[model samples]
Target: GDSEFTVQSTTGHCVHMRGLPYKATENDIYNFFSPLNPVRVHIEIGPDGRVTGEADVEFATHEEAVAAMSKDRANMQHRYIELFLNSTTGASNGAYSSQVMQGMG
Candidate 1:
């Protein structure tokens, strides 16, 4: 339930909305987690494609948060995710120890 990271968004409120399904991604993450704990939401998105992973505190509405998290993105900064293919391949790295992937179930 987690992915890539970067300390670039230290200034702005960023949200990295990626590692999605690539097609009609079923995003239960609402930038504000309440329905379920496994997949909540995030804060701002880094210009370098980093997610703070703290939506419930900063972001106001869950709908606004979810709306920003619905789609084919490797990681969103807010409006769009800077597609960086060719450079790094299938990379979803993060800092938070608890945000690491547990492998496909």
Candidate 2:
């Protein structure tokens, strides 16, 4: 027997960005993705009021979303930008957890 699970596909318009320079801006992100997809960019900021060196870029098409993944490891300013498909999950923090079951009850 098999237990089933369900997972929802993320919307095809968003991309996660990392390794951004502290000075990276929305226009920078737009420049990278626009004239192709062209949606919007949101740079992350820390609670301490500092740029977090990360961002999210939203496109207008599924093709653009797939294409954006190709930009991973590309350079932006002094940093090598890393891109990933954004998740719709409730935003898991950079952490892990463990558990054990006596048996498949």
Candidate 3:
């Protein structure tokens, strides 16, 4: 009764960090995850023109990305951040765009 695929899948080379400080900078994030050497750090922006306190960080390799998970709930400027394996591989595409165009027709 224990043979099952209950584990979560991950993107392997990237992670999504949430609960970040609103004023946290990309450099700050890089330092927070130091030693592992992140390849890219992209902070999210909200539609209302404000930082979303979340970021998508890419590591040099899947091993480094997995190691970064150890920093989950780690502190940064008194705020605890949450980390999750990023699974997004591509943009949402033009599905929404087509819906809007259909409505206009």
Candidate 4:
């Protein structure tokens, strides 16, 4: 369901966020961006709204994930924790981030 896209600056923040349109809860956001997901190739959100297109999710710990997520979240200026987390992961076996787009010709 990663078809939708939205880009906008957080209120009063000089930051912009762009990604799939999906509604996610705080816990969902946490889990989705948490290092627990161990397989998140690209965390479009974490900490809150920032994005970390980090090539890998083999992070050290949850705290590390939170830290990294914070960094990107700062850039996007996301304050909402409960939000949508949409992305494309290549082959559930944890291979490589797909260079291909979903539903593309």
Candidate 5:
């Protein structure tokens, strides 16, 4: 008989940010989500050599990530930014992408 091996699926400690200014830098994001202190910030770039106005912010812990969600719809550079819980399994999941698209429409 073969033994079964199971792996735990831990939730990610990253938060997805949308509606950011095209010129926004990683440092800007770091300051915006300050106090929580993100471990990393990655701004997305489009194929056309333009920013996607989106970014992934990784926190030190899942709790901090959850708290970061409170900043959803927060204003930055006069534009409202949206935040969503990210999954550890993948970078961009469809769960919130559709909703974000709809918001744009």
Candidate 6:
């Protein structure tokens, strides 16, 4: 259901990977971050339906996500893929409201 684009609202249990090679495969991601234990691999697609150079690798626990930080800007295949702890806040369309916190102000 396009959960990837659905926006996040909390500290995510995921790692956002970018600058991936077009030939990169899910197994490749799993093999690359073998220490972190990659559970799922999702890559984005361009408007033309071609796979983009970005991807998201989800881990089982938030701790795993934190542990993966050390791998930031790590090299793989041919390009250096950037890894970041995903921000769970905000919906896929950026519709996740901040009004709840706004009331405190």
Query: On a 0 to 100 scale, what is the lDDT of residue 18 in model 6?
Result: 75
Scored against the true structure, residue 40 in model 5 reaches a CA lDDT of 59
Clash count (model 1, backbone only): 11
Stretches of candidate 2 off by over 4 Å are: 1-12, 87-105
**Per-residue error at 8 for model 1, in Å?**
23
Off by over 4 Å in 3: 1-12, 49-51, 87-105
Per-residue alpha-carbon lDDT of candidate 6 for residues 1-105, written as tens digits (9 for 90 to 100): 432233343324566777778776667776776575556577776677564656777765656656666767888867877777774433223435433454443
Note the Cα lDDT for every prediction shown.
0.33, 0.61, 0.63, 0.33, 0.63, 0.63
**Positional deviation of 41 in candidate 6, in angstroms?**
1.3
What number of clashing residue pairs does each candidate have, in the order they appear?
Answer: 11, 0, 0, 5, 0, 10
Estimate, for each residue in 12-37, the C-alpha lDDT of model 5 and write its tens digit.
35767877787677777877765655
- 21-103 per-residue lDDT for model 3 (tens digits): 78777787877775655465787757764647677777656556666677777887878877777533352232233223443
Off by over 4 Å in 1: 1-12, 31-58, 61-105
Give one digit per residue, the lDDT tens place, for model 2 in 1-105: 865443233333577787777765777776765456346577675776463767777654656666656676787677777877763334332233222224432
lDDT of 1: 0.33
**What is the lDDT, from 0 to 100, of the residue 62 in candidate 5?**
54
Displacement of residue 98 (Cα, Å) in model 1 is 37
**Mind giving the per-residue lDDT tens digits that candidate 1 earns over 12-100?**
22234433323322244442223433333334435653533323222223443343343434344343342111112222233333323
Name the lDDT of candidate 4: 0.33
Clashes of 6: 10
Which 10 residues in a row give candidate 4 its minimum summed lDDT? 7-16
